[PDB]
Design a protein around this ligand. Structure first.
Ligand SMILES: CO[C@H]1O[C@H](CO)[C@@H](O)[C@H](O)[C@@H]1O
Ligand SMILES: CO[C@H]1O[C@H](CO)[C@@H](O)[C@H](O)[C@@H]1O
Ligand SMILES: CO[C@H]1O[C@H](CO)[C@@H](O)[C@H](O)[C@@H]1O
Ligand SMILES: CO[C@H]1O[C@H](CO)[C@@H](O)[C@H](O)[C@@H]1O
Ligand SMILES: [Ca+2]
Ligand SMILES: [Ca+2]
Ligand SMILES: [Ca+2]
Ligand SMILES: [Ca+2]
Ligand SMILES: [Mn+2]
Ligand SMILES: [Mn+2]
Ligand SMILES: [Mn+2]
Ligand SMILES: [Mn+2]
Lengths: 233, 233, 233, 233
C-alpha cells in the first residue's frame, strides 16, 4: 500500500467514483475520490500550466491550472500533510488513457521544497527532457521524445495518442518533505502540459503526486485511477 | 488614511483594545484589533525569527515566530489580500515602546514577492544594516547602529532601551504585490529580531507590515498602536 | 561625471571611435571604447536574450547574447569591478537611435546581486511592463506601451522606430553592488529584446549598465554613445 | 578511470607531489597536482566557509575559503569544464587523514546548477545531516553524527579524529552539468566545515568535487590523494 497525495487534472468524468460531470481539477489525499474539486475547462491542443502550493503553517494545499488565454480553475483543501506523508518521499507526474485517449505531454516541470538560514532545500527545473534524463525515474509507458518533451502515455510515431496507457515520471532524489526540527515546511510545484485528442471526450488526465520513496505503479490503476491507486476507495 | 496589513509581535497586552492577556502574535487587517491571535512566549534577550507566508490561491495569511530553543507561536487568517491592498505597496518593519520599553532590534530581513515563466518578482535580503542603507526608508526613531543591526526604536549609547519610541523601516522600491494579469500572487517575509528589556513586562512589539506606497507614521500610533494605525478601531 | 560599467549590444559600427566594422557585443568600462568586443549577427525582428555575469572572485565580466535559432555572441573582460564602481549603484537599460533607427524594445529584464548565510541580496524580474511601473525610473524617450513591453526609444503609433532617440530605464532601488565585509560579491543580469528596423543598417544598440545612483542621461550621448557617455574618450 | 574536477582545502603540504610548503587551497583538474594554488591559513577548531563558482561564458573556476574572523584564501583557474566533464555527473565532498589527522566535519552544503526562461536547474541545501540522509551517497568512513553534522572521516566517540581515514558524500541525483543546447551553463557550491586536530600539523584536507556518475573511491587515494585519485600523476 503506497501512500499518495496528488493534484489531479481530471479530463474525463467517472461519475461513479465521485467525479463531477465535467473535466475538473482535484486534490486527492490517499484516495481517488478527491477531497475537493473544481470545474475545469480543458482546452484541446493548448499548453496549460499547473501550479501547486503547500504551506505547513497554513496547512492548505492549493492548486491552480490555466491556459495562455486566461481560463483558470482553482481548488484548495485544508490538510496537514505532515500527518499524511512519510518524512522522505519522491515527487512525480502521472497520466493515463483508457477507452478514451489524449496526449499527456509534459513540456516543463519544476519543484521546490524548503525546510526552515538553517534551511534544508531541494529545487529542480526541467524544461528539456533529453532522451536519457538521468535524474528522472520513468515508469510504465513514459518516454521522452525527439522534441525534448516527456510523453507520460504512449503516442504513436504519427503523434496520435493511444488508449489504455499508463506512465509516471518521478524525480530521482528523494525529498525531505518534512523533518521534525522544522518550523516551516513548504513546497511548490509547476508543470506545463499539452493534452490533445481527436476525441471530443478525451481521457483520463495528468497528476502531480507525492508518494513514499519505493512507490511503483499500482496494478489496476489505469484510466480513472490515474496510475496512483489500486482501487477507487 | 493609510491601508495596512500586518503581522504583529505584540509583547504587551493592551486588553482594552482586544489583546489577549499575554504576549502574542497577531494578524492585523486594517485594524489594530487582530483578526486572529495566538499565545506567544517572548524570550527576553534571545534572537527570534518571524516567518510570514501568503498565497493568493489559498488566500491564507500565515505567520510563525520562534526562538533557537524551539518555542514557536503560529497564527493564520483567511483573507484575500487582493481585496485589501493597492496594486503597488511598500513593505516594512515597525516597532514601538510606550510606558514600558524594550529593544526592537532587527538583525536580518528578507522579502520575496512573485507574480506568475512570465514571472514578475522582487526579492531582497538584508543581513547587515550599514550606516547609510540606501535601500531602506527609515521613519521615526529608526536608525542603524555600529554592529550592523537596525534599531527600530531608540536605544541609548549604553544599549538600554527607551520608552515612547516609534520607528519604521520600509524597503525603498515599491512592490507589485499583485497585478490583474496574475494567476498566482504570493509573498514570504522573514526577519530575525532581538527584544531585550530590564522590564519584567516589556512593550510594545514589532510588526512586519504592508501598506500603500506613500505611508508615513500615523499621528498617535506609539505604544499599543505599533506605529501602524491612528486609532484603535 | 558619471561612472559607468556596461555591456553593449552595438548594432551600428562607428569605426571612428573603435568599433569593429560589424554589429557587435562589447564590454564598456568607463568609456564607449569597449575594452573587448565580439562579432554579433543581429537578427532583424527576432527576440534576442542577453545574459551578463560577474564574479568578484574570478574578476571576469562575461556577456552572451543569443537568438532562438541559436546564433550567439560572447565577450569577456578581466576587470575587478570593486575598483571601478561605488558601493551603491543603480542598474539600468539604455538604447539609442541616430541617423539610422530601430526598435529598442525590452520584453523582460532580470537582475540578481549577492553579497556573501549572511547574504545581502537583491533580485528582480520584470516580464510585463505596466503603464505606471512604479519600480522603474524612465529617462528620455523611454515609455511602456500597450503590449506590456518597454520601449527604450521612441516608436510611432504605427510601430515604426524613430531616429535621434535616447531612453533609459533604471531600477528604483539602489543596489549594494559590493560592501567591504564581503568575501563574495557577484551579480547576473538577463534581458530579452526585440530590435526591428526598416533599415538594412539599423542603429544604434541597447546596453545593460551599472552607474552611480544619481546618474542621468549625459548631454551629447545619443547614437554611437548609447546614452551612457558625454563623449567618445 | 574516473574523471575528476575538484577544489581542495589542502591542510598538509605533500611537497613531493607539487604542494606548496604550507596549507593551501587548490583547483584540481584531473590530477592531484593542482593547476593553481593559494596560501591558506587553516584555523584549528574554527568553522570555515568554502564558496566555489564556475561560469561557462567566462570559463573560469574560482574558489574562496574563509573564516568568521575574515581570513580568506582565493584561487582561480581558466578552464572550460565543458571540455573535461561528462554531460551528467555527481557532485560531492571528500576528505582524508593519513599519518596526521583532523576532523573533517561538514555542517552545511549547498549546490546550484543552471542550464540556460528555458532553464534546466538543480539546487540543494543541507544544513542538518540526519542519520539516514536519503539524498546523500556516503562512501568510505563517512557517517552522520548525533549533532546533525556529516563526518567525512572517522571520529571516535570522544570526538578525537583518527588517521588513515577516507570518506566521501555524493548527492543522490545526477547533475546535468551541461547540455549541448545551452548558451549558459554555470554552477556554485558552498559548504561550511570544522577541521580540528590535536596535531600542530593536521592532515589531509577536504574537497568539493565533480565526477562521472558511477564514481567510487579509487584504491590508494587516502592521505595526500584526498579520496579522488588513484595516483599522483
Ligand atoms: C469506460 O471506462 C474506461 O475508460 C475511461 C475513459 O478512458 C476510464 O476513465 C476508465 O477507467 C476505463 O478505462
Ligand atoms: C500605559 O500605556 C502606555 O504604555 C503601554 C505599554 O508601554 C502602551 O501599550 C500604551 O500604548 C501606552 O503607551
Ligand atoms: C551618422 O552618425 C549618426 O548616426 C549614427 C547611426 O544612427 C550614430 O551612431 C551616430 O552617433 C550619429 O547619430
Ligand atoms: C607521511 O605521509 C602520510 O601522511 C600524510 C599526512 O597524513 C599524507 O599526506 C600521506 O598521503 C601519507 O598518508
Ligand atoms: Ca476521472
Ligand atoms: Ca499590545
Ligand atoms: Ca556603435
Ligand atoms: Ca596535501
Ligand atoms: Mn476526478
Ligand atoms: Mn495585540
Ligand atoms: Mn561598439
Ligand atoms: Mn595540495
Amino acid at each position: 500500500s503506497d501512500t499518495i497525495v496528488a493534484v489531479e487534472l481530471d479530463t474525463y468524468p467517472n461519475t461513479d467514483i465521485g467525479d463531477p460531470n465535467y473535466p475538473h481539477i482535484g486534490i486527492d489525499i490517499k484516495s481517488i475520490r478527491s477531497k475537493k474539486t473544481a470545474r475545469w475547462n480543458m482546452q484541446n491542443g493548448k499548453v496549460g500550466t499547473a501550479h501547486i502550493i503547500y504551506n505547513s503553517v497554513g496547512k492548505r494545499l492549493s492548486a491552480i491550472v490555466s491556459y495562455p488565454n486566461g481560463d483558470s480553475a482553482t481548488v484548495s483543501y485544508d490538510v496537514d500533510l505532515d500527518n499524511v506523508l512519510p518524512e522522505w518521499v519522491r515527487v512525480g507526474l502521472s497520466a493515463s488513457t483508457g477507452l478514451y485517449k489524449e496526449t499527456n505531454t509534459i513540456l516543463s516541470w519544476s519543484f521546490t521544497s524548503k525546510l526552515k538560514a538553517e534551511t534544508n532545500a531541494l529545487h529542480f527545473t526541467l524544461n528539456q527532457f533529453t532522451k536519457d534524463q538521468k535524474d528522472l525515474i520513468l515508469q510504465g509507458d513514459a518516454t521522452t521524445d525527439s522534441d525534448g518533451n516527456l510523453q507520460l502515455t504512449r503516442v504513436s510515431s504519427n503523434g496520435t495518442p493511444q488508449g489504455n496507457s499508463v506512465g509516471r515520471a518521478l524525480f530521482y532524489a528523494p525529498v525531505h518533505i518534512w523533518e521534525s526540527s522544522a518550523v516551516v515546511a513548504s513546497f511548490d510545484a509547476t508543470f506545463t502540459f499539452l493534452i490533445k485528442s481527436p476525441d471530443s471526450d478525451p481521457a483520463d488526465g495528468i497528476t502531480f503526486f507525492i508518494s513514499n520513496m519505493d512507490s511503483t505503479l499500482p496494478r489496476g490503476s489505469t484510466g480513472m485511477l490515474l496510475g496512483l491507486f489500486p482501487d477507487a476507495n
